[model samples]
Target: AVGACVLCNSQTSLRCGACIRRPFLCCKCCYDHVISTSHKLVLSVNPYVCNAPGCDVTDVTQLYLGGMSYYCKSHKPPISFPLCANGQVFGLYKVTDFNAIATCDWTNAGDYILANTCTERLKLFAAETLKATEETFKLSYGIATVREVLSDRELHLSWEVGKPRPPLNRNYVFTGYQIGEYTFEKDAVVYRGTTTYKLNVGDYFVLTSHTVMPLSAPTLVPQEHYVRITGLYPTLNISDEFSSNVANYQKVGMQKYSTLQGPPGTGKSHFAIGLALYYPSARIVYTACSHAAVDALCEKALKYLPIDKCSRIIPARARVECFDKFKVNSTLEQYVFCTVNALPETTADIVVFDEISMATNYDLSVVNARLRAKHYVYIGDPAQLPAPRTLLTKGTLEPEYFNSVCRLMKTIGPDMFLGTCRRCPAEIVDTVSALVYDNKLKAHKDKSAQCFKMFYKGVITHDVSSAINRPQIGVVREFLTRNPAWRKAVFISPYNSQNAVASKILGLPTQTVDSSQGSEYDYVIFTQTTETAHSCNVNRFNVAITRAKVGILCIMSDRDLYDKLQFTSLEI
Candidate 1:
């Protein structure tokens, strides 16, 4: 017998039992009948070949149809089946039957056959799957929303849901990006949130995005660089002497330079402090020929400055290296101290060379060295006295020192005469200025016309010590003892030694010339010491004689220093 396989067609003849049937076919008749009816049969084979159920066939033009073969040139798997439709299916295979007279080798098993649409449909499905996976993998974390695809670039992400707020860290590093790229990699877990995303070319990230940087540190501004001087007694009236002198100095631009010559109790030191406070920018140097002057000025300034303003002024006891080193503090105003050697090279706006006439040539040299700023105020009465003879003997003074001072006066224009004696009567001021300048004291004609009342009624005795007695202290004690309301009083002294002597004798505070530089008194007393009876030391006599305004007492010896007492005669 001869027969054909139902799958790939191979027309090799075979016999019954050994002809494609018998031992090889489980149901030989079944295969024969299907082949005879439709000329095709389903077959199950290995993976390399078609694996279908019901028949073992290898023919290209034949196909299985419902347990039978069909002779059709268009034989293909069903493309619209619900279970194994569109020519695709998934499962192992088993053959159901195999019966043919041509082959007894037919076997029964099961398998699946895919349709012709399987290849085209799988290709389309695979494309869509890959596209979805790519989209999910393209997320980034950064400040900006758009990110660039490059080796060394940054990705950005941002969000703005509600009100505008400052950046979290108050900073941003913007990274830019190029267009049309799609590759990026992050080593760390990049931040992800429901915010706008961005791409950039550079690694620009918002500083706010990162927690590495800080927002603020201590700030140093220009306003902090200044020394603030405020809380001045706006309505506190000043002495006429101070106001007028300050006015004259300002008018002549002498506020910048010039020494202040006035008796004690006329407010010299107070005036200097006031000037320093008023012109906050001026680097005021308060120096005295003696330490007593420094202490006195310090004390008064401390007492006078408002507590609030006092806290802001720096006070250096020793030396200051620079202006920047000056710090505002609570106890004292900003000031530096040194011998004339450590005088700053920079000229202060106002170099108050207090007790200028008594200042050594070295002191003057220091003042002159400070030529940077154009103002100097010498606070001293030329008539007050010379420095101690000991300082002179130390080889510090030159023979022409006094002459140079005289010449300096000649060069520096007319002097600003602080002639109003707030601490002395007009008659006493006249007598002293006249005695010192050979009657060249410039008297205010209006002041001379007043009937001056004695702030203190005292007498100048023949004894110098007695004349310099603590009359102000005694009067203060008496006034307070009588009135019990008196708080303060002023005492004027010509010499520091005399001031010391008076303070010791009366147990009152003794301030040097600079300490009492631009200050005034309720009462003033003049100690006329006849111990130094020489016209050559007229400066000493002048300073001592003029330190009073409301009242004055002169202790005259039988021999007068200024020839004003040739004959004992009292004339008003």
Candidate 2:
């Protein structure tokens, strides 16, 4: 069967090697396809003629290494050819470096051999010395089946060989020949072909390659009472009664795996900083799920802790710009700051987790596995969203189900709830506290500072008659148009679909509830389409309402559902 190349429309015998239904291409077209697409190799419709000199025998049944290279029964390389590359070099086998050596101009012996175009003209150089040597040179290419993966970086390999096949030696590394995508990282396990072994007639031979990469080993592993992170724990500065309760929770933070629960506007980060200061000399490791959360905690640490005591560690692969203002370093410091995924192995006297409600059991286990800590404190609000459910099961063979480590720890661990709302004004705080926290969350009574106050009295409700709700969007637009200050407000929706509509129309910073959890704005416009209101949960409702510092305006068509959630909305 024959067909035109998918890209170039060239009539040829070759087809895409990785595709399910192989698409035909000429050699150049197929090579171009490999270069441009994820499909890495090419296959031929007919057996390629052997590239070895004077080889007319055509009963060849073996794998094709690129560049029209093939071999008949009598002319093919020996089984040990790749393993023993000091011997003979055959024509045109695709050779790539397994671990690209930096000192060798990023090229290997195979590259040198290929560059010379003839083995007779090539002089092999010692990899370390960077000069030609009298010693018998070996090419870093060969074939070995992976018998066992000893570890992520180590592999135990075994190969079938013929007479006088070289014995496998310790610390010997070779590129593993693989048929798919080329891996480029220094630590990645790469498999690429090397030079071939000379052969005689009628011998069974198989080609393989392996490059052993060593694991990235961690060299070393290794708190305070709040005097005042915010001049007091969220609500305690003005009231001694709240201060006494906070002092008791400060003691509870000393327990193993202690959990601190709080709603939005509560000083969880404030409490975390104060607790760190409570034990000034204690080695503390503070981690959060987001870079912004880690930066927020580190910012507070910078205020009380000395510059020598604070260090923020970010992953080498992560974009540095995503993290906020912090002197980012690669090594651990006394007061270590990092994200949950970027947490390095270290022993700490105290381990603090911020916004832990966003974490899962697996996330918790990863931290526990990596960090050795005697006392641990987790701070988060369970009323906010949990870790967003992954579509891992939909993409692969996996199970669906997840639970929060914070939610479970609230029941099992020495737990305390933060009782004050410091980020919001009295009216906004009162409404959110009554609806979500059963009136346990108290408003900060020092209302003289009106920075976090809103233009409206409390929550405002607007009717969204359309599912897309463009009319109510206009209402929001007009309001923001009139009040230039409210134009800086964030738009929140429970669904991505609604957020996309609002964001496209409103020209504001719009986000879904999940992405908006750890964020706060001066004012929030909570838009709910009729479609999304049907999927609303108590936790979701609680999170949406509590996000605004000053006030929240909610747009919904379902007034009964809104009222059912115990919302006392100001009529629009």
Candidate 3:
């Protein structure tokens, strides 16, 4: 019987059994109705397969014949193979069964296109191919792969055993091979390949083509130089007195105490700083009559030392426990305060007292009682101003007090005195030293000559300010602007009235002497105006005058007041 069309139900057409068995098809007319209703209806089964044997079968049981089935006359295979007419075998089995010997002999007839025209493109292609090969081999074999591609003309292979195959052999062939052949020139030596060899120590390699020879291990050695200083000149000279004192102290295992004294413009502070640097390991304490002087010396010390090293010794924020107490972290636990009462109980190896003349008898007593250090150096010019007498009477008792203190100090340890003033211009030192020591001594006649002349010429003045309020404000401004350099220029007022006025003018909060004490400045401007009669005494004036280093500038407008005051020179 002829198959029936599933769509049209025409008896002349073959019925597709696969389509008829599908759940989507009910009868022969159902397919026709669906095709008519939808323009783009899809039939899963082939329409042309209706003419095959048993074409009218409606069940899957009879549709398939084992795994091989025949298609109807109208149906064609999905892919077509090359026919033998073109001299090529079309059968898949034939190609798979070909002998390796026959395939290897087969020549590539078509013209081969170059893998890449440009060097960069060629490198990129080679890299990508190598990477892909590496990934594929790694995935399949679980073995690490090594690959390299050389494009040297001489190394190129023209013909080899296999054409293109998986798992390529180490020695494979390339199409266009050339030996010492340049692409740009025919006779020029272009691409050349050489085998690389790794060498052990002391081994050398010489190339056959090139004259360069590589060398290996060699040998070496080491070497050094020296200096000394011996002089007697004043500037660079080592004083016999100083040397002898140092030698004697060293011999006796005793720490030497010394003092460098002169007038303003003297290199006392500079010399001290130099000494500090020279003996960095020594524990040195520098105390001044005022905070300004201490701060100036500290600033100089910081400049000489590295920040980390300096900071370790001197913290940025010095801890202040009392008016006369502050702590710097340097190995010395360096403390600087106005009074000896402020000195820490634990003594350092070296104690330096700056502006020593201004130190009070109480201060001396405090030092004598508290200090247990090996060396005590007092640095100040006694000729400048003596410590103010807090006691009422000027009697044998006061002298006895000083003598007793000196005698106690002498018993504790021998003192070595250094009288040279390297900082002062020579002339200034000479004149000021004479006036200060009461013509008892002459200044060193050397480079400091200018300093002596300046002191005598009154280049350093005690009258520093024009207005009463000027000193405090000027000093504060100087501190804020110049700091430690001009810190020595600090001014201490006997009473808080002048300080309050100055603070108001300078926009600073009012500060008391006790609150503001122990801090140093470059220059000190002292305000001595007082309402009480006791404040007008010589002690008050002496205290204010002795605070200055370069010089004191006393500003007094009342001539009568000045006449009534008695001024006496301080002698060492």
The TM-score obtained by model 2 is 0.51
Order candidates by lDDT, high to low. Answer: 2, 1, 3
- State candidate 1's TM-score: 0.37
Q: Mind giving the per-residue lDDT tens digits that candidate 2 earns over 86-141?
A: 22112222112111111233223333322222111011111111111111123223
Off by over 4 Å in 1: 1-247, 251-256, 263-267, 277-280, 295-347, 367-374, 389-400, 403-406, 410-415, 438-536, 548-553, 561-572
Per-candidate alpha-carbon RMSD to the true structure: 46.2, 23.1, 42.4
What's the lDDT for all of these models? 0.37, 0.51, 0.33
lDDT of 3 by residue, 414-483 (tens): 2334455433324334344443334434344343111100001111112222113444344345444643
Residue-level lDDT tens digits of model 1 in 1-572: 23332222233222122222211122333244334433233233311112354444444223333222222224335532211222312112201122221221111111001110122222122212222222222222223443343232333434333423222210112223322212221212133222234433343333212111111111100111112212211223544434644554353242334445554345666666766555554455555545445445656556544433332222343222222222343223345432343344444455565655556433454445543444556666555544432111122222123323432443452355555445554555565656654454554422322112223323333222223434534443453344322233343444444454455554544443333443444344333322433312445445443443433333333234435411122222
Per candidate, the number of residue pairs that clash is 98, 24, 44
Greater-lDDT candidate between 1 and 3: 1
Look at candidate 3 and tell me the lDDT of residue 34: 29
- Model 3: worst 10 consecutive residues (lDDT sum): 449-458
What does the lDDT read for residue 294 in candidate 3? 64
State the weakest 10-residue window (summed lDDT) of model 1.
108-117
